[PDB]
Fold:
Amino acid sequence: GYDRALSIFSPDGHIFQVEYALEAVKRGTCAVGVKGKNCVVLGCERRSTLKLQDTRITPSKVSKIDSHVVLSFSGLNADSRILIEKARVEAQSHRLTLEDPVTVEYLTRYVAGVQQRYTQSGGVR
Amino acid sequence: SDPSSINGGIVVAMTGKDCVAIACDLRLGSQSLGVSNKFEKIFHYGHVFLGITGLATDVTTLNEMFRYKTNLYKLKEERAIEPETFTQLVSSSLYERRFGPYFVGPVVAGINSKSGKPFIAGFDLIGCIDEAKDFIVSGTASDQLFGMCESLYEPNLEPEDLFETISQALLNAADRDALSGWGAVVYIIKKDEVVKRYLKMRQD
Amino acid sequence: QFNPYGDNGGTILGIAGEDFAVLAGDTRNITDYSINSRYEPKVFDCGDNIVMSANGFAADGDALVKRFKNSVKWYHFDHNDKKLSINSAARNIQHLLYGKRFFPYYVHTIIAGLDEDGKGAVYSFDPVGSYEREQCRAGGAAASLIMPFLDNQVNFKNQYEPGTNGKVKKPLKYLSVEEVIKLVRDSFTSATERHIQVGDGLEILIVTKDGVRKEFYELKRD
Amino acid sequence: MDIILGIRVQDSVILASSKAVTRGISVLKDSDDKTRQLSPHTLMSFAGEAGDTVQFAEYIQANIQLYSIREDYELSPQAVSSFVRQELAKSIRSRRPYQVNVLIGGYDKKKNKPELYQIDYLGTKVELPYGAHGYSGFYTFSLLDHHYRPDMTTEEGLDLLKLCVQELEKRMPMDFKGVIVKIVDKDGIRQVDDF
Amino acid sequence: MDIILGIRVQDSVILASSKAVTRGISVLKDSDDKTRQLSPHTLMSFAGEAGDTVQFAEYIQANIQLYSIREDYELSPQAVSSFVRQELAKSIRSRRPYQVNVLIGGYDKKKNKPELYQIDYLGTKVELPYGAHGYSGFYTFSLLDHHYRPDMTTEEGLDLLKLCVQELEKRMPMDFKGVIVKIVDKDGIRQVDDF
Amino acid sequence: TQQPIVTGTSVISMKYDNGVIIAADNLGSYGSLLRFNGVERLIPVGDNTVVGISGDISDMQHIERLLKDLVTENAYDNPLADAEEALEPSYIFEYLATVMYQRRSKMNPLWNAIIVAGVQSNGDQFLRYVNLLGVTYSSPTLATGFGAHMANPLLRKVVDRESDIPKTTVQVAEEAIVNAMRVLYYRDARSSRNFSLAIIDKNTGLTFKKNLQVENMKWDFAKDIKGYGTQKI
Amino acid sequence: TTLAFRFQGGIIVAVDSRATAGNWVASQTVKKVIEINPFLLGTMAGGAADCQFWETWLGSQCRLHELREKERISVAAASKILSNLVYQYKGAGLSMGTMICGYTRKEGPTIYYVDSDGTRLKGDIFCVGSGQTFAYGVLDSNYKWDLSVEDALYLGKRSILAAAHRDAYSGGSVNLYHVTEDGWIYHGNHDVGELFWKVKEEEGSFNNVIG
Amino acid sequence: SIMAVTFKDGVILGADSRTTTGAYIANRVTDKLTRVHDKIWCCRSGSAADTQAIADIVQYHLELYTSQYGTPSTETAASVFKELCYENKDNLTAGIIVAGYDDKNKGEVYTIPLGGSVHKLPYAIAVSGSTFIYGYCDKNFRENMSKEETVDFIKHSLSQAIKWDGSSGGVIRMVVLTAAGVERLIFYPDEYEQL
Amino acid sequence: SIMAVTFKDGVILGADSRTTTGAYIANRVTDKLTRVHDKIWCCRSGSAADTQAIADIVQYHLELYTSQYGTPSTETAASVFKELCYENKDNLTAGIIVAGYDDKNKGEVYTIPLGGSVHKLPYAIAVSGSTFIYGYCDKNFRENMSKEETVDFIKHSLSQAIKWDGSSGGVIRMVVLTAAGVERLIFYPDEYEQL
Amino acid sequence: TIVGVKFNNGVVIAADTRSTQGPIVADKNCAKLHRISPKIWCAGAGTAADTEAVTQLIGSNIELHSLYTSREPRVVSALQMLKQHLFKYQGHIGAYLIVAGVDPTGSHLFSIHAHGSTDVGYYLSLGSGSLAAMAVLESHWKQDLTKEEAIKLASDAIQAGIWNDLGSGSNVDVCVMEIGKDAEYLRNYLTPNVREEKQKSYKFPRGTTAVLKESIVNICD
Ligand SMILES: [Cl-]
Ligand SMILES: [Cl-]
Ligand SMILES: [Mg+2]
Ligand SMILES: [Mg+2]
Ligand SMILES: [Mg+2]
Structure:
């Protein structure tokens, strides 16, 4: 298999591939999260340069991971689908083994773990 | 499906100074299930004592058979049968069923009324005689009894001492066998008196 | 069809005192009705004041002792020459045995030594690694002959105080090393008489804070 | 043929016997009486191999009824149990053995004492304050060991039996369709109409 | 795990499942629910080898719940039954096959029609107005071939189920400790509290 | 899992004051007792060890090659291969013992009984046994198959215990071994008259004797034996 | 013989201490309750090694859960770790009958039956082992939800004693535990030898036994 | 290994002296040549017990025959052997060679193999497991041979068989049946091995 | 029946021509003599399939050996045969005799029996079910025999094996390996039967 | 371990004294030397009940035969009667016997297999220790043995069995049958396996055992 170390250290102690990934996020459409006393709200920007869009079928920016947890994002749309799928699978896997839905903290810790693994695995960005 | 270890139970016999002792547990089970805690395995025909371990139906049947045979012996001979002679009768009667045997481990104990000599003997299920000076063991905890007897036993014990030795031999053997216990009886046999003692033991 | 197991006979005996522990074994190795050796030791000093015996199938017993001795060596390397406590050894041997749960070692395992408070310890294992600490354990061919005797003479089971109507039990107490070796010697001479696979020689390993001492005694050779 | 219980109280013997007859996956009958009156003061309940049970029970009944006529005398429960044991002890080394287990409950008019005998298909006889055959004993014996008292009355003995039947109806996999209960005392044999 | 019944009426599907769990000669539990909700309008009852039943049921439940989240859409009963059949059809040529039999009762919101599917451990799927697994079918199939009518209501369907359960309680050797009944209609899945 | 086809019979050995003796007949037994001759079952490894093998001949020839292979390997980058770092009986045995046990644990055993006879570097006599189960034991006398039943009892009269070894001379031990080989010829259907005997002596080195024959056999009394009881002629 | 039952005062767990090899009584001092954590208990029934090893491994898995999630594991989750493990080994010959008993705020007092066939059951009463039928007879007859702690403890002890007597493969001594909101509490080791005669004298039961 | 050869003056019977249980030689000086009459002998192969029982019965029949009807023929002796072997073939494993001398018929050889059939031959040889050879050096055997030739022929034939067998071994025994009388010959390994 | 005999000028290989399935002769003109190299041949016994598969692989190994290292020794050919037979002994039933001629070593004979062992002999004979005889007329075989002697010796030996064995039959084939080259001989029944 | 050894003027048979059920020693001093007739003795291996029963039945029938014929019984009669009985039961009676005796014909030594085969020999051995015993016999037996030589050889052959065979042990029993003399039966001829003194005495203090009930048993009429 393709083994090459793409995420490596630079003389100044930075990992450029991880930092260039943050640049892709900065390019992404804006996403905001505000939590109140008895609710959380997720606001998401949609760039208006795309008219003749079918808003019915177009992938929505906010994704349900389970019936009680939602995930929004900024950055590469194609990449977001892989994290959402892995998260949705882990949500059902947790219910199956622990007989309880995931805490928001646990689902976060899992997604963050996946993102971390792709910063020191060979062959992946 | 091993007839000798369905009902379970043990017999041990020992010789002392001018006395013999024979003892048994009181358990009758159907494999794991304990059924009766009052199933005595020691019978007497006059002054000759017979213990029988093994399949309980054959224990009952052989008791009824040796009562029959010794009753007729006494009527014809006009005297009670002696241990040495009774041993030969048990042997004869078992080997008669050579190819359809009684699933039993009989033990003979008693004092010869003429010579006063303490006598014990054991048999396999087809009637091979094991004549022994020291002790005889039978049943599901025979291995355990052999170990207890071979270490505890010494020759020419007095009746009161022999009681303690055989009692401790049985109790400690029964407590290491699942299919033995649920009470115990010890017969101390002197020339012209016989004491029968029920032992207190753990009921598990 | 090839049968990978055999029975090499022999019997072993562990007894824990107050400030000592003994592990005894006969020195006879057999197959069926033949004597292989009259002197083949199966009680071993493993280091760290632990004595061990794996009685049953000699090949599996040799293999397990070899693997445990090696486990002690690598415990020293990996944990700065730390002494392997008898409780830690016992847990390690559970894992060695359960490792082969679906192709077991046909041995009854006994280890003896001192616990971390300096008190005599004996641990006994089944073939697949269930274990428990006892003051008294016999293993192998003549276990059924020796064990009820030890119940009576060590743990004073079924003995009551004379005159108390069988209400007051004979009080438990620690035996001296001298009194324990007597019970071991009498246990084995008794087993030699009534078990064809037991005899030839008796090797006792005694474990105190001072170390591991050996005693040998002849048994009947028939 | 599954559940047969027996309790000997102060002045009587109580036999409880399951009503269900099951052949294959269907329950053919729910009112079967697994008992024969051997003599006016001796009752025998039975369970085992189909056919053998009734054939054995009726054979014993005929032999005891024959003895009663010949001697104009009721054979003691001890005597009846000894006869029944010997018949089963013959059976076990036969070409085709009777696979039948029995309880014999009787009132001995000479001793004025109730007697319960438990005999298995091998001819293994035992006298008990309470008894059962097959898997019945596994649940009921612990209960009897605990609640049974030797000087109990017939009403007390019936209440202790209800407790046994309730435990069996809870923890037993088969529906044995309840029990027929029969009391054996000095006045003879009567059936408890409602249980 | 023994009795699982299903009846599809006009506007709903009724699943009846025995409450008893028996291990050896003891009844461990008398309140066991042998069903998993696959989706809000699809229920699956199951019976077979111990462990395999629940392990298989929960595995299917997880996969359908995953599809529901991914597509934000409820899979049709026909689609769920086809998925379940394929999983069992894989199992039968596995190293160790799942020995599980299932009924899938669902209300299709697109067709506004109740649907009952019967799948055995081999992956033998069939759509039926009424179904059962194991020995329960031996007594209820012919009983339902007589009393079943296609335009029956939920109340009519529950009365016809009572007749099936009564027949089973009479003629079946085991005590299955009654049934939990669940109705699947346009409004979702509810349990009949008293039966 | 296998079944042995062509097999070698008993190997017998004992210790004496200054070394060990090992012997084995030169016969390969077939299926229904059928005989074949010309088989050497004594493998000399170096000049301090002889390995006697019984059981499957094919598995014996495999073990023979392993031992030849082992000697070659020990010589590799070893200046002291013919001195201090030479192969010892204890090393050769432990290798074979390891192989036998891991083969039985893979359920593909070498169907053999092996005795390793030799003298160690410090002059200590080495005698140890290993078989297809990987079971190992040592004794002043060791024998396999029929030898265990018939040779051991004869050899144990000469050396019953360890203390008897210093009192036993090579002349006595060789006589005992040669007598034991004749008894096996009398009573073992898979034995042969021709045998090989090897002596490993600390003072005199390894002596290997081939094409030995059983001599001074008693058959004369056979003429007097007639019928199976009542026959007089 | 092992039982665990739920009542007003929490959970009662009672076990015997006998271990057998065929008809040979190997030990009378076996500990058939694994202590896992201060609010979790596990019983042992079947293969001694299988129960002891995998229930010691369950205590390790439960410790890891609490390190990772900073919270004690639920009885439901702990029971399912063990049941999911044995299901992987199904058909390999593992022999286990066991109860996972504990209290957590979110579940309350909970008992789970788990066996080597992969069965996982939640219930108020369970009895596991060769003596389970003898224990069930006593428990079911005298079980009330509103039993006092003192009476519940005695009933569990009494139910094991009944099984120890009638079952050949059960005996030695009775080990008693009580599980509440504050955790599990040991109620001592009662030798059947001494206990039987005390119970017979005080209770006036066991009339089958020669006085 | 047993063989019987007819020559000019009569017939010679030869065999080995080895009896085996598994690989253990029970008897290394066995007499496999048995007298059923003064000048009627047989070679025994198969079960030692079976051949002895048969040989003893045949000897009884010929002793009784001689008392009533005088000296019996070799054919008569063969017939008695066959009758016992054929009628009891199910329970027997005996292979027998019968050799006898008449003044009328001279030397005759009959073989009764495992079947229980009878065959009259000039010579016969059996090796391994009662296995008769049809050819066995047909150009090495000629009719009307000499005593020494015959002795040399049998000595060689049996030596070859002992070289390749394991069942066969020990000494070679021969019995010479002629008008002169009965002679018993024995050859020790050291003589016969160097051939 | 197959045999290989070393003589003065080289070695001769001999075998029968009969292949059997049960009692049916599948091939009565079988060539049991196989070329693995110009002057290295073998005799095949046991499974026809197994011996052919092995003989084909050995021929491949010796062809490859010859390409790299030049003409291989008879010992090398025997070693390759043994390696295949020993390592695959569980799945194989092949008995092989290897005969070859070197100008250095002259005639050599190696036998690989069912075990998978290797033996170097002056001559070898295998008869019946791959059964190799140890002595086989040891005083009939001498070292440095003539070609005519060696052909007569093998012809006689095989003809005697065909007389008592049904497995062996048809023609006798021989292959003569010498410095001169390879000669193929055939002897028809009418020649070899009258011996 | 049982052996028979023929000497100049008679035959000697010897046996060990160990009885076993599986690996357990049932009897440490059982007698395997049986009297068929006053000068015809038998050594038995295999099923202990079978060897005793078959020896007593033939012994009984031989005694009745001796009375009827008014002659001392012959060993061939005991041999013929035993083999025909054992053959009838097709090995189901597991008796392996060494039959030796002196009668008017002379001194005889025979062995009988359980299936009914018999052999003749100058020296024989049977049982689990037969191979250990036979090794000693093959090593030391010679023609024209004296009685003292024959007893030594027989007891040495038994000793080989006792030490090297797990099935054999305890003491050595010998019976010597010489022509023109009474057969001498040397029970416990050798006792090389005496139990050593026990380290401790396990005699209990009286009252140690708990007693529920006591009663006097009436054994009189
Ligand atoms: Cl014979
Ligand atoms: Cl071909
Ligand atoms: Mg007990
Ligand atoms: Mg011994
Ligand atoms: Mg009964």
